[model samples]
Target: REDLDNYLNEMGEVTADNIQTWLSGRILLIENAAQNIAINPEPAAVASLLEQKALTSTFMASYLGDATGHFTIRPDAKMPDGFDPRVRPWYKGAESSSTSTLTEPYIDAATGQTIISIATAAKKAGQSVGVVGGDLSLQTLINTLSARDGMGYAFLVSADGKILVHPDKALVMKSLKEAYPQDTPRISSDFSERIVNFTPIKGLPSVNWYIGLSVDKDK
Candidate 1:
């Protein structure tokens, strides 16, 4: 709905001047509704509908593509196991703090590709409570990067040395697991080190995650 868009646009460009205010205001609104729905699950069905709409709308603004993509929301209190912000830091900066902040772009070991994820904590009654997050699909990002001209390709690997996304998805899925069955040993070995080297092409922003886009000069 346009209601959330109105909120985002009203906040103006997301700069230091207004990010905190914008984020706090929106969090309050969402939390209030969440609390209400928790109390009256039926009548508050509208809250659920609005939440879904907001999530879908927000997701499209960042990681929507033609081939494939997935969004996973992790509320503050329910983060996944082995959740280390350093791995896939997609939203981190001075504008926010560890108390309730987002991360920056970083490669995810589990998925085996660079991805962007957002994180924020939910509060109730003036107490820090839970965290919420959103993750973008790296496969879609790879597809976009690979489509660029002059002999290009993109591959997404998991932390365990498995390829998750590539032009030939079937081949990756079939052979990657067999290629690297062990995790800690593979990552620590020379063979795995070779796959980790990826030099970004000029003009592309520097990302901490392993992402490579190379072009053949001879071609």
Candidate 2:
């Protein structure tokens, strides 16, 4: 929670000059209401920077009515027959709060890739209207977890033991408890950074979010 608190603290600075200019412009584009079928004449840009800042592969911008929604990858993308942003995680996540927030990880509908989203409420002159968000790939989070200085690898998970990332794609997004019900997975701690030697080992306790360094063993 502290990390989330800190992340939101930093996000609060987004409304500065550059970002606000884009957000207001985004709403302004839609304010005229579906002129023809294109909705907004201006394309959704700038928010791309906002979306990419979170290191995400996709973005979403939505209105309350017929304007439907938009995304960074496919701005004119359409939803399933009954889809509603009001019920979507990104919109639902930001609805009660004005601050930007990170939603829980899930498998995306279109791409089938594991994803997480960060969203913020969009308003005009203090009146709520809609929302904007970015969908980050679990692969990005995996890279962060697997990033190593000079030796082995790392992986992280929720406190409840859900596998957040792993080198084996098959093991990703799985539950640690269910993965290892009988044996307690061991974690290796020996590794050197600036020429430190790491003995490569395998597996880890799937009961908590943790870090481990598997060494070269032969080293």
Candidate 3:
């Protein structure tokens, strides 16, 4: 039991550190991109940076959305009629903050992929100008939770019971209760007597997710 506790503690710390490190660098990159877009505001000029990032980074997509609802995404895709970025949660969240913001996890309807957005609000003269954002699939962080041996494995869960990451893609965004029906109230950590341990990621304020590990002692 003591060995398990130590292992879980180290895993939690390492996972949280990895996430924070990646976020810090990515935040700076996105903020710099947003500032440049805010100054230019021209799709042609903006596409240079967005496209460059798309080719060089792990981000699934990089984009710029201005206050007027004009949106530009790299590796271009046509937006449906009347698409508005101003109303999107990522835009709104970044607009309301002075620094880069992280949006809630969302399951893409078209691809059924779990993704999150990290964005920075572009401001001019103390007013909002636009937002520069990147969409990242949760798979980017999967290595942090991968198991070292068959006796146990790690996963991520949201404060509200949503599964953020798991070996089984089918359960990626499902509610915890859907997997363990006995988990009354859904968020409760009940997994058929499995020894579950968790740690909340603290450096990223916008995320209320936990890195957790479950051990099957009988194994």
Candidate 4:
């Protein structure tokens, strides 16, 4: 992506010591989101195969058109009841589009960490079976957001309005919906830091998400 290319284009002097830096992003193409989950053993194994790539973790959420559920993570991890990846925003959103897409950053119920999902529709016999996807931590992208030093805070929101990344840990997973009633206006106040700009996170297959930068104008 632009990230890697920009890193390489930097001038001055390129030395071994200064070359390697933190990296956490990649491209993934899954022919069938549920192909690995169709049979026994599940998709976690295939996901684990990605450990060597991006720092992000991978997984498959099968509607299990042929079966029921294969909600298993690697190393014998267990998924909770009513666990259906089909209902997730990533899966639901991908099914509608012909290409892979990204979901708004959401709090991972299991990890309590902020994550943005990339989902591709799994096809079988020319029919979409389910969704295959993975999650990337928002902070990693925040680092790339290029906010103006510490005086600026980088964060993200859903298609609607949900807090994805913020300096405040408590507000990480909360949403505008949680603080307002359906009958009321959604935006009435400003955040402690004011929004200065927004940049769309590109090269993410087909996901429609963006990042925002807020500067502490007071400082």
Best by lDDT: 3
Please estimate how well model 3 matches the true structure, expressed as its whole-model Cα lDDT: 0.70
lDDT of 3 by residue, 97-181 (tens): 7778887667543245778788888776667768888877777656645632235777778888787777776777777778667
Model 1 agreement with the true structure over 1-219: per-residue lDDT tens digits: 244333322222222123234334444443443344334334234335335656545432221111111222322133357654433344232114444333333455445555544444334464433333444455544454454312334444434444444566443533344743563223222223222223212121121222322222222
Worst 10 residues of 3 by lDDT: 183-192
Per-candidate Cα RMSD to the true structure, in Å, reads 15.4, 12.2, 3.4, 9.1
* TM-score attained by model 2: 0.49
Q: List model 4 lDDT by residue over 11-120, tens digit each.
A: 11121112111111233434333444333233554455333232223332222211243443332335556767666676677777787666666765445667766666
Flag regions of model 1 displaced more than 4 Å. Answer: 1-54, 58-119, 123-127, 135-139, 147-149, 158-164, 171-197, 200-208, 214-218
Q: How much is the lDDT of residue 205 in candidate 1? A: 19
The TM-score obtained by model 3 is 0.80
Give the lDDT ranking, best first: 3, 4, 2, 1
Candidate models: Cα lDDT each: 0.36, 0.44, 0.70, 0.46
Query: Candidate 2 — which residues are off by over 4 angstroms?
Result: 1-74, 96-98, 123-127, 147-150, 184-219
Ten residues in sequence with the least summed lDDT for candidate 1: 61-70
Q: After superposition, how far is residue 182 of candidate 4 from its true place, in Å?
A: 19
Model 4's TM-score against the true structure: 0.54
